[PDB]
């Protein structure tokens, strides 16, 4: 009976299989932990990509706003030059208005003195109609020459609004820069440590040799199994145990004893 128990141990057997199970379970738990960390890093870099798209649209808004601002600045410069030209034009047209008023009044006073020749008197009506038509047309022109000041005010307000939009876009750009900086610091710190976990897991058991076995990915089940196997191996050691080298020698000595006894 004793030899039967020794042989059953040889195939000690309980301790060996429990050790194999516990090392495999530790390797699988490390693999699951690093896989979950990698999934967290994937989520974080997906958030980074989303923030990068937000930053890209912010940058496109900034560049369109700034090109609009510079083109509107050039437009404002040319428009102010044009309104200065229109101001000198309206001044000289006002001088022409005064000249027309002068000649008009002169001919009107002249035929009054003549009464106090008829061809000269009827030749004034064309002058009067021309004078009044020109005066009305040039007053209408002066209307828009004044409205262009309101146009300048409107375009200046538009430029200021665009500048404020650019300022807000730059503010959100720097906010997003800080967000991505903190997120990349976090993922960096994670990777520093995730690499160490990968290395130690590979040292304990190769990644290919641990991915082949299929075990639940839930971390609660992994910890429960780890606790169960630890308690079972502790109980087995309490039932029987000795130095590791002694067990290594027994691995073969027990089988040798069994084979020699059987024969």
């Amino acid at each position: 009976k004793s030899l039967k128990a020794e042989y059953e141990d040889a195939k000690l057997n309980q301790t060996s299989d429990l050790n194999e199970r516990k090392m495999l379970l530790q390797a699988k738990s490390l693999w699951i932990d690093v896989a979950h960390n990698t999934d967290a890093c994937k989520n974080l870099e997906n958030e980074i990509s989303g923030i990068q798209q937000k930053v890209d649209e912010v940058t496109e808004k900034i560049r369109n706003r700034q090109e609009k601002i510079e083109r509107y600045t050039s437009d404002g410069t040319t428009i102010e030059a044009q309104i200065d030209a229109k101001v000198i034009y309206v001044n000289e047209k006002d001088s022409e208005h005064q000249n027309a008023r002068e000649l008009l009044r002169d001919v009107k006073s002249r035929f009054e003195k003549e009464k106090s020749i008829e061809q000269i008197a009827q030749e004034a009506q064309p002058i009067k109609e021309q004078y009044d038509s020109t005066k009305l047309a040039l007053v209408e022109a002066q209307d828009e020459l004044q409205q262009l000041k309101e146009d300048i005010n409107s375009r200046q307000s538009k430029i200021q609004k665009y500048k404020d939009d650019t300022i807000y876009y730059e503010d959100k750009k720097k906010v997003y820069l800080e967000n991505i900086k903190k997120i990349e610091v976090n993922v960096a710190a994670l990777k520093e440590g995730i690499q160490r976990q990968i290395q130690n897991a590979c040292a304990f058991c190769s990644k290919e040799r641990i991915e082949n076995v299929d075990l639940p990915d839930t971390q609660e089940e992994i910890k429960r199994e780890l606790d169960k196997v630890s308690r079972m191996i502790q109980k087995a050691e309490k039932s029987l145990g000795l130095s590791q080298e002694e067990v290594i020698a027994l691995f073969e000595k027990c089988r040798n004893k069994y084979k020699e006894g059987q024969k």
Binding site: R105, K108, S109, E112, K113, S116, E220, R224, D227, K228, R231, M232, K235
Partner: protein, 256 residues
Amino acid sequence: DKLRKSVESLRDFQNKKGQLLPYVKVKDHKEKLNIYKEEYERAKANLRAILKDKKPFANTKKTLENQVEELTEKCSLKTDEFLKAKEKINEIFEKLNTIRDEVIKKKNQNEIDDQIQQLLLKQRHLLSKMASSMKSLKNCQKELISTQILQFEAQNMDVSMNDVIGFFNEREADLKSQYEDKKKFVKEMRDTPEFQSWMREIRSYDQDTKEKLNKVAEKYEEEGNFNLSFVQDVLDKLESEIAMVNHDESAVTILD
């Protein structure tokens, strides 16, 4: 040696109380129901508060729209009165020009002479009237600018409240998502996957003798809480620790 297996048969059979899984499931369902109920209460309170704030907010939106309309009407009125004052100024300037033209015409004609002095009396009075009326244009300018700059902050407030309304729209979208969360909580507490039925079955399998064992187990679970971890581990380990019995109650039976 068979006494060992004879004694350990009772230990192996003791695992039947593991029962324990229905009890842990019952407590889990109770806490889930409590969580769902408090979530429902919180969501309903939030929706009620946000709606009872929006409705006054809707009234404020309506009154702000009316104020914007009535202030734009006043803005048009101030511009109209400014334009009429400018027209009056132009009319008096035209009158001045006409009287000056008449003065020069009659002076040229002269070259009784009181026809000059009579119009010189009128021109000075007209100039004085123009000077006095310039006060009317000055007041129209000040009033006009003050009115526009005042009704402008009100419409700025209106647009800010519109932005707040958009934020409330986002918040009520979040509330609708919370309502969908309530719906999925209801679907979770369905307990149609063998729970209302499983418990009412197990707690009535034996209405005499066994009612006491499960009551005692429930009381023990409250004095000492053994979560699903204990259920999964110990219920099997109590017999798997030694795992060398062969569960041979027949061998123990032939002993006696």
